[PDB]
Design a protein around this ligand. Structure first.
Ligand SMILES: O=S(=O)(c1cccc2cnccc12)N1CCCN(Cc2ccccc2B(O)O)CC1
Lengths: 18, 336
């Protein structure tokens, strides 16, 4: 699923600026 | 028309405070340290208790040497100067600030509900009414900030707290810049960047409305619309093919197509009618804008109040707060 791909390839934790 | 008058007075008050900022309104030994709430590459956030009153605060401690090392002087000075000058229901308020030989200190009211980020990741996604309630508060906050000619540029669930009434508090202002024309810094968090920030062309306040689109999508889906492992790859997806979960309503998809609009001359919030194209969109039909502003709407979610509780924050190694015998970087932070 898209959610599964987010977990696999996305950044799931807190995200830094820059 | 009465809105014009309110915002005119708000701009006058903002500019007066910006021109003559408050300084040096407490000191470190006025506070007891309780717990570390967060760490970053040049500072920390501590839960502290004011010794005289017993009130709890979040104390943001910035190490002056690390700020200078990481080229964050202007951003840090700007955050403090903005915070003490703005006044709006959904913006954190600066209660005290001061500096010593080693550090800069900003002291805010403690909000034990913590970040939207942690509630969103726990629950997975917010229902559309729940997401709409938060979104409306952002819409009003940007109406306010944009009337001051400020671009916010730092929207994401990480920078949004949920207070004990269930309403939003926007936390961070280092990146907030006065822009009545264009600006050009590659500034922000990758998933939330408008295409025109990534590209070298200039950008304006419309990037905040793009970011609102990203926020609404992430709140409603549980994940942002453009994602990948590394920032460069996130940028490539952004620069506009969006897919919507099948559970998104028709009205939500239509709103998002107009907020996540690559053509900034067609993007809602940036048209002749400005914020009113958003307020009047069908997805917001049930939103009582004045009641939201007045905090008279029943919130969809109230963080459980456990009694100075830190259950909504992670645990960190508790490290010394060391104040050097020597003044560090005095000249650089003279105005703080
Ligand atoms: O710790 S916060 O959630 C926070 C911020 C403001 C008021 C608060 C009132 N009560 C509770 C928490 C509070 N927080 C929200 C944003 C995340 N930063 C990360 C951070 C951590 C350490 C140093 C700097 C930064 B920064 O990115 O500039 C820390 C501040």
């Amino acid at each position: 699923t898209t959610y599964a791909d987010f977990i696999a390839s996305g950044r799931t934790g807190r995200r830094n600026a820059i | 028309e009465s809105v014009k008058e309110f915002l005119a007075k708000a701009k006058e008050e903002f500019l007066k405070k910006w021109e003559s900022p408050s300084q040096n309104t407490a000191q470190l030994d006025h506070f007891d340290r309780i717990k570390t709430l967060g760490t970053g590459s040049f500072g920390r956030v501590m839960l502290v208790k004011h010794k005289e009153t017993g009130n709890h605060y979040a104390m943001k401690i910035l190490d002056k040497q690390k700020v200078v090392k990481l080229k964050q002087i202007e951003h840090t000075l700007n955050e403090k100067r903005i915070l003490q000058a703005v006044n709006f229901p959904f913006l954190v308020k600066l209660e005290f600030s001061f500096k010593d030989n080693s550090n800069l200190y900003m002291v805010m009211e403690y909000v034990p509900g913590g970040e939207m980020f942690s509630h969103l990741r726990r629950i997975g996604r917010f229902s559309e009414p729940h997401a709409r309630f938060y979104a409306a508060q952002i819409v009003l906050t940007f109406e306010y900030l944009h009337s001051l000619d400020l671009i916010y540029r730092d929207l994401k669930p990480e920078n949004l707290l949920i207070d004990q009434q269930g309403y939003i508090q926007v936390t961070d202002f280092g990146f907030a810049k006065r822009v009545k024309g264009r600006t050009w810094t590659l500034c922000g968090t990758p998933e939330y960047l408008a295409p025109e920030i990534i590209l070298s062309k200039g950008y304006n306040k419309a990037v905040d409305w793009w970011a609102l689109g990203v926020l609404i999508y992430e709140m409603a889906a549980g994940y942002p619309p453009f994602f990948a492992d590394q920032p460069i790859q996130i940028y490539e997806k952004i620069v506009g093919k969006v897919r919507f979960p099948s559970h998104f309503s028709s009205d939500l998809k239509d709103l998002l197509r107009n907020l996540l609009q690559v053509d900034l001359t067609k993007r809602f919030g940036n048209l002749k009618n400005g914020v009113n194209d958003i307020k009047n969109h069908k997805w917001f039909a049930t939103t009582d804008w004045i009641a939201i502003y007045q905090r008279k709407v029943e919130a969809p979610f109230i963080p459980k109040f456990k009694g100075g509780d830190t259950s909504n924050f992670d645990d960190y190694e508790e490290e010394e707060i060391r104040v050097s015998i020597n003044e560090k970087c005095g000249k650089e932070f003279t105005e703080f």
